[PDB]
Symmetry: D2
């Protein structure tokens, strides 16, 4: 037997950081959950009880907090890159660091129409995430995402013209509810190292903002032929607006809202044009995925 793959580290490391402007009194907070998993010449910890090669997971935890003390934690793409780079630079025998960060929302409160200097609300469980893979000799691979963005539109969604055979019972519709939880990921061009990441720092917040804006506006405005067709439009727009992205991925549940036929009760009409009351379905759900990149086809387009 032999070790074909191995990584290890610390998961679920909750981290808060505050910035205090002593001049203005304005405080700003950041909260995340961090995972760091390391790879390298560690196989003998598994095969030979050789712990000398293990940077303790507790030490990885300490290092996350120290790194947060000594560096900005925003944008998370930068913080993850700094953190991952540290492990491959500090430890000769560690050759990859895999850093996942979930950023939690703390949005400044407005009180009597004025932004409060030190009070915040969790205005959504929507997350902003990164996955930063720092691989010695192969640079820094970053996937950025937003997730848990839950939306619904009450009309201007359709679904007809799908394949019909002996397994099909679904009625075509020209007017339905569409609701989903948006998970959208943009994959950056490979960066050669931390310097290149730093050189693009403003692009991280800007591209997250673009992705969120495009998602919301396209969802709201597209008279949707299908989840497939709508999500493709989102992805193509995001690619058009940031050339340093290589791909955009969406993963979207179709969270079904079923009509309720009430005509058995006093002839009540609650279907089609008269549909007002619906039954949200917890499960099952459609699940629709795609990864969109830029075309290289020059014939048969």
């Amino acid at each position: 037997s032999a070790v074909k793959a191995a990584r290890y580290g610390k998961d679920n490391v909750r981290v808060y950081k505050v910035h205090k402007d002593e001049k203005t009194g304005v405080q700003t907070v950041y909260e995340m959950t961090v995972c760091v998993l390391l790879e390298g010449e560690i196989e003998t910890s598994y095969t030979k009880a050789d712990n000398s090669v293990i940077v303790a997971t507790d030490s990885i935890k300490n290092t996350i907090y120290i790194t947060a003390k000594q560096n900005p934690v925003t944008p998370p793409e930068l913080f993850g890159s700094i953190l991952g780079t540290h492990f491959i630079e500090k430890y000769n025998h560690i050759h990859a660091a895999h850093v996942n960060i979930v950023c939690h929302r703390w949005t400044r409160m407005d009180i009597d129409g004025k932004p409060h200097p030190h009070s915040f609300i969790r205005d959504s469980e929507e997350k902003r995430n990164v996955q930063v893979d720092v691989v010695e000799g192969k640079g820094i691979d970053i996937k950025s995402s937003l997730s848990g963005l839950t939306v619904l539109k009450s009309t201007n969604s359709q679904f007809w013209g799908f394949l019909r055979d002996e397994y099909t019972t679904l009625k075509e519709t020209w007017d339905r509810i569409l609701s989903t939880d948006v998970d959208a990921t943009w994959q950056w061009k490979n960066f050669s190292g931390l310097q290149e990441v730093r050189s693009h720092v403003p692009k991280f917040d800007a591209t997250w903002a673009t992705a969120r804006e495009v998602t919301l506006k396209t969802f709201a405005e597209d008279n949707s032929a299908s989840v497939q067709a709508t999500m493709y439009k989102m992805a193509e727009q995001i690619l058009a607006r940031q050339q340093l992205i290589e791909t955009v991925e969406y993963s979207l549940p179709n969270k079904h809202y079923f009509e309720i036929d009430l005509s058995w009760h006093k002839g009540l009409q609650n279907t089609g044009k008269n549909a007002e009351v619906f039954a949200p379905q917890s499960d099952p759900n459609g699940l629709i995925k795609c990864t969109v990149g830029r075309s290289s086809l020059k014939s048969k387009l």
Copy 2:
């Protein structure tokens, strides 16, 4: 043996309703989860296998949807009162209906600075709830609440002067983080029936808005001596602003954020005035409760 208490019905009934203004095109959505439990002369279903006294839970479910089709679902205090009243009026042998409603947020999207006519975002997992107990011969008892309102302030919270004995290790502090999930409940004066509830309908949304506003502003502005002292101020203000409330209850976790001493590492200073990076604690948590009403003491105040 004998039945000392019994209630039964349907829980976790998910309900959506849409309102469509055909003139303007503006659609408005409502989503809730409903529980209805009935009491009455039902003991023989338990003791004698006498199902004749059971209004099937499936029928209770049907009735929830029918009631939502035939009535407004807002404010939830009204919808719950209509629904509960139905069961005690329709069925001679049913003498109480207990209606719990959780209202889910669907906030209209703004797209390019304009409110969208039919697209919505779950802008928070904060809920607005009601508990409506319709008891034949004893009117309608309503508790209204907001829950899952998660907030944090980064300073202007203190905790000192608490009891110190041989069980005490906690250091006094004059500057800490305070974070909580607000569960706030206001208990209405007993209503004699559905007519009286209807007579007060505008007060329901108004008092929910007041409770939320007072909660947020007091949290943000109180230089807090303790969770106890801050929550009391919230409750007293809400009581002062709605005379048809009898009590206000708060239940508040103290979701601790611990300082991290890093002085063992290169003399890094991250405590007291230099505290920037903190460890959010998932558990344990303080839990602080009180119910505030109006005073009737005339001496020894």
Copy 3:
């Protein structure tokens, strides 16, 4: 305004304890989650920022661990009674202690047919719980329970003869699935204090075992007329087997499994006697409750 009710303390205190028999090598583990909330002359912490009356929640936490170090943690009824008694005895101004304990399962592993001396499996998320209310001058009120005991029977459940009117669509059935999550609570006679609790210590584990045994055997063997009828039989049996119990409460969801008509596809027969494949329903669910005590009726029985 005035404080009508108040309690405060520490929730979600995770506690593990090990017992080691040094002679035999056998180790035994206990794990729980504890909440302690105190009441007393504490109103001025809310009204006057008077923290002198507050036993810090952190100190309550310390006290939970110290109490676990100095006392058995089993049965939980005893541990909770010791813990609650401590607070009302130690602090003159504290007049009630409310102790909730959730006990987590760590069942000893059998390895090659022999019980292992120090290895355990979480063999179920079923819990054993207590709620111990220690009230100065009014003794110790204990509710014991089992919860999260999830069961299913594939036949020998029926539901017919229920009320049928214009709200009813449910078909009568003489053969259905019944599945539930059992929450069963037995309420003890008031105890005068810790001595009386100690005097009954063996009864706690014995009555929990009885409740669990009766629940399982009655569920398995009753050709059930309804959830109502089956749960009543459980409760009456438990009352008959422990005279120091005053009431038994059950709260049971009816976790529905729906037949799936497949006759639209190649005439497949999957209903009634030919029903093999079912759709488990996550929501909604029936919810059936009752509290059973001993009868005092001497006429009209």
Copy 4:
């Protein structure tokens, strides 16, 4: 822009099946949650609003239930293979089917020491899973797993000899608690199609049983040098016992239980040899992974 990857289908499809032996009266139940995602010539549903290429997710759902009606649902490796094969055979333009199955435990109750013919208990939230990828022209790739197997040992775990530098605070230990949630995956040799899967059917249940047995016995008996060293022993044993497995993967959290120094209180000794009461830590947690295969090194072993 162009579609680089796409798959879509139905997730969270809950399925129950009963088998009834009419001779003996013994009934046996199976419950799972199923996801099926399809790939193929479907890009135009995304790019051109061409729904003709979409087998509706609702139809995929219907097909899951029909397949369960017409075939055994056990072992899940077989059921998933049948289900995935159906989609690539039925639809010319569908070229892959990805079938994930989570199997839920329904263990037959013993009542008065005898197995009950139709009553079951959810004896653990441990799952048995499969991931079956049916790819036209490339056969059937199966990963089998067990997950959510939660275990603890109270001694015979150690962790010393790890790297120590300026980031290290963790004390070496020669006696600690070890607790984890076991996620173990065995990856089968590629199968050429459904016939080859059928030819190995008995191996599926047998290898799951082996994996579970090896996991439990190794956990219980290994005087563990680290999570790394223990998990490697598990994997190598499983590989040795089934030649049709290519790799075994473990993913194991180290769910920490911290000692509690109580020496500040009355000199109580609760560390080292006197450690009895511990604080289970919800987060953070170590996370340790490896994939083990068979060696092909012939020099420098």
